[PDB]
Amino acid sequence: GSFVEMVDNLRGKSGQGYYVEMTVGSPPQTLNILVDTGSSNFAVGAAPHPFLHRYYQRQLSSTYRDLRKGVYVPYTQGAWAGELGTDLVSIPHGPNVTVRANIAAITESDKFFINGSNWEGILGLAYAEIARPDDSLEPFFDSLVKQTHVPNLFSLQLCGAGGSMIIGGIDHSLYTGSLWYTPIRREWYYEVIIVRVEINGQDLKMDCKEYNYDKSIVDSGTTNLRLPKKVFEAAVKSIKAASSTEKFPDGFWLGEQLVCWQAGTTPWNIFPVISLYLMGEVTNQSFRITILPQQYLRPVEQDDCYKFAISQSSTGTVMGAVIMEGFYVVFDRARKRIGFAVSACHVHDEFRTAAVEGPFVTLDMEDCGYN
Ligand SMILES: C[C@@H](NC(=O)c1cc(OCC(=O)NCCCCCN)cc(OS(=O)(=O)Cc2ccccc2)c1)c1ccc(F)cc1
């Protein structure tokens, strides 16, 4: 395909975050940057840190421009403090352009960087509304689109146990079947609306407003499929019931205890598939994405240990890596929609595969959103 050079430009397959190489400053300073659709700030470690192998050295960049303003960004897991500036930025295995972007030099941090993760910064791909200090600090992708010809669209193929980030388009070799789109409800986080949830085909039977209580987002920076407390509780009960041929401790379901199997003997078959129906592009029409235990049971560095990766949240549903690793996801910003298609690299077995199917009839989907 025409976008071949961007294929396989991500790393972090069996790791702690998917990252892409980004070259900043002049002379060139390339760093590993976490791909995060759950935030909107581009920031890079700029001082030595125990978990960082390399960092941004502003004094060595002749093109660096100090903005003379501090910036602080808290996340679900950790936070960092830094200094704002702008510099030249290019993505070697991404678009063939170079833009001057806002860059936050991370000088201090608390539980942000992850030991052994190999990434030294973060690329917040969400919208300006949630950028810090405020929405006036233009995010990287916004700069890319405004300064260049690059189409306002990117797509992610996260390959778990690194993947491809196609910028400006789509590569058809990354998925099979059809692409199904759900509207981006509002441009801040990549917010979507979930209208129905099934465990092995069985409806969880909860008011859809509960599935999006507060909000539902697609976030490549979050490991798990996080669900509102009420939904999490009902989901776990149903999953346990469907996998009753085997019993596991309560801690396993809370992500506190790991369960290991002899190398290559994990009974994937005893666990149910999980389906999330998303609002479609046509009135009263929806489609569903289905993941396998290979997606929600994550390996932990002759024993194969796994952690149940569906957890609870008090800030809404978060469709993280657990969801994204089963699909090729198209962030069509230009048409305010997110597309899903079965990923050509998703992990499965000879009996089941992840799926994206439709259409389905779902009424009153507009009422599912939180106001
Ligand atoms: C990068 C990594 N992300 C995480 O481990 C990560 C990020 C989160 O919130 C967003 C956030 O903090 N974004 C800010 C950027 C990340 C900062 C991390 N301190 C929440 C989160 O919590 S969780 O519900 O998934 C349970 C959990 C906790 C710790 C480790 C694994 C799983 C885990 C990640 C690992 C694997 C992936 F496939 C994708 C992402």
From Swiss-Prot:
Changing residue 214 to N: Almost abolishes beta-cleaved soluble APP production. Glycans are attached at residues 96, 115, 284. It comes from the Eukaryota. One of its GO terms (cellular component) is synaptic vesicle. Disulfide bonds join 159-345, 208-368, 260-305. Induction: Up-regulated by the Ca(2+)-regulated transcription factor NFATC4. N-Glycosylated. Addition of a bisecting N-acetylglucosamine by MGAT3 blocks lysosomal targeting, further degradation and is required for maintaining stability under stress conditions. Acetylated in the endoplasmic reticulum at Lys-69, Lys-205, Lys-209, Lys-215, Lys-229, Lys-230 and Lys-237. Acetylation by NAT8 and NAT8B is transient and deacetylation probably occurs in the Golgi. Acetylation regulates the maturation, the transport to the plasma membrane, the stability and the expression of the protein. Changing residue 36 to N: Decreases beta-cleaved soluble APP production. Expressed at high levels in the brain and pancreas. In the brain, expression is highest in the substantia nigra, locus coruleus and medulla oblongata. Residues 18-341 form the Peptidase A1 domain. The modification N6-acetyllysine is found at residues 69, 205, 209, 215, 229-230, 237. Inhibited by RTN3 and RTN4. It is a single-pass type I membrane protein. The keyword Transferase does not apply. It is found in: Cell membrane; Golgi apparatus, trans-Golgi network; Endoplasmic reticulum; Endosome. Keywords: Acetylation, Aspartyl protease, Cell membrane, Cell projection, Cytoplasmic vesicle, Disulfide bond, Endoplasmic reticulum, Endosome, Glycoprotein, Golgi apparatus, Hydrolase, Isopeptide bond, Lipoprotein, Lysosome, Membrane, Palmitate, Phosphoprotein, Protease, Signal, Transmembrane, Transmembrane helix, Ubl conjugation, Zymogen. Responsible for the proteolytic processing of the amyloid precursor protein (APP). Cleaves at the N-terminus of the A-beta peptide sequence, between residues 671 and 672 of APP, leads to the generation and extracellular release of beta-cleaved soluble APP, and a corresponding cell-associated C-terminal fragment which is later released by gamma-secretase. Cleaves CHL1. DXXLL motif is required for a proper endocytosis and retrograde transport to the trans-Golgi network, as well as for regulation of lysosomal degradation. Belongs to the peptidase A1 family. Monomer. Interacts with RTN1; RTN2; RTN3 and RTN4; the interaction leads to inhibition of amyloid precursor protein processing. Interacts with SNX6. Interacts with PCSK9. Interacts with NAT8 and NAT8B. Interacts with BIN1. Interacts (via extracellular domain) with ADAM10 (via extracellular domain). Interacts with SORL1; this interaction may affect binding with APP and hence reduce APP cleavage. Interacts with NRDC AND NRG1. This is Beta-secretase 1. It comes from Homo sapiens (Human). The gene is BACE1. The chain holds residues 58 to 446 of 501 of the full protein.
